[PDB]
Amino acid sequence: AAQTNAPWGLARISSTSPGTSTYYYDESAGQGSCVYVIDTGIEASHPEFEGRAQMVKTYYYSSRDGNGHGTHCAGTVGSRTYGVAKKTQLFGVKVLDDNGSGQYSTIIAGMDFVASDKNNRNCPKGVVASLSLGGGYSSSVNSAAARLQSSGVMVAVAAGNNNADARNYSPASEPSVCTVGASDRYDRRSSFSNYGSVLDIFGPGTDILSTWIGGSTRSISGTSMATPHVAGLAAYLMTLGKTTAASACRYIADTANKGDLSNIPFGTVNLLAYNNYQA
Ligand SMILES: [Ca+2]
Numbered sequence: 001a002a003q004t005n006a007p008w009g010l011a012r013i014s015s016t017s018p019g020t021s022t023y024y025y026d027e028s029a030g031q032g033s034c035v036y037v038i039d040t041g042i043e044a045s046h047p048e049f050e051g052r053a054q055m056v057k058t059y060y061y062s063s064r065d066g067n068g069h070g071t072h073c074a075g076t077v078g079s080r081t082y083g084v085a086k087k088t089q090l091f092g093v094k095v096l097d098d099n100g101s102g103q104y105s106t107i108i109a110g111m112d113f114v115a116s117d118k119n120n121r122n123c124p125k126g127v128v129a130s131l132s133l134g135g136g137y138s139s140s141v142n143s144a145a146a147r148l149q150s151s152g153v154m155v156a157v158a159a160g161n162n163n164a165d166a167r168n169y170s171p172a173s174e175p176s177v178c179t180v181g182a183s184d185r186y187d188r189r190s191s192f193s194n195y196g197s198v199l200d201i202f203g204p205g206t207d208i209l210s211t212w213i214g215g216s217t218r219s220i221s222g223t224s225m226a227t228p229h230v231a232g233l234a235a236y237l238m239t240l241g242k243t244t245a246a247s248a249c250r251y252i253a254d255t256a257n258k259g260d261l262s263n264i265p266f267g268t269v270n271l272l273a274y275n276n277y278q279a
Pocket of ligand 1 (some may be wrong): 174175176177178179198199200249
């Protein structure tokens with residue numbers, strides 16, 4: 001399949017060179033996989049989700065996304081026009097309030113919730129969790145992410161937006177999950193992206209068009225935008241049978257475009273997510 005005039009980040013993950021505009025992908029499109037978006041919520045009624053999104057848990061008064069961040073991330077995972085895995089199922093867990101903030105105890109509870117809830121869902125091709133959030137180092141938050149991964153869920157987390165070493169941030173610094181940095185459309189490390197030895201992979205993160213609340217769209221930037229590209233790619237590859245939840249991050253790194261990014265500090269991987277699609 002081919003989507004013409006795609007957002008640049010979708011085109012980039014299906015190409016060996018920057019500057020293309022077509023997203024090439026297998027028709028299966030993540031069907032049979034499930035992605036939990038652990039964030040401010042998801043506007044499940046947005047036409048771009050085609051009925052494939054639902055809220056399953058909130059830690060606040062409502063399950064509605066009053067912010068937009070979670071709806072944007074979910075759209076990059078799995079919306080029709082803006083998504084990597086256009087036929088995946090999306091589950092929303094609202095651990096962040098409508099200002100985009102949340103306490104660590106709530107974020108941990110949402111992680112443990114997903115590890116249990118997946119056992120009640122029909123996800124024959126596997127389960128992914130996308131965490132576009134973080135803060136200062138916490139061993140408890142890292143341990144919760146490690147537990148989720150151990151339980152059989154592919155965990156992708158944002159590296160953070162401080163132009164610093166991600167070792168000082170959580171859950172970015174947990175080695176056993178997939179920590180995602182951000183790049184821009186000219187194959188530079190995004191100027192805000194964290195770096196360091198704990199990063200596993202880069203994905204598109206600057207000027208990313210996706211869904212927004214009120215049935216709208218908008219373009220924003222962050223490692224929060226790179227993470228759902230990698231979460232969606234994992235769901236896509238699991239549906240194709242190329243990898244499993246336990247080994248998807250390593251498979252994505254093994255098959256990435258290598259050495260194409262600029263402004264990568266020594267000791268950080270130079271790897272850009274790539275779907276290896278051949279018609
Ligand atoms: Ca890792």
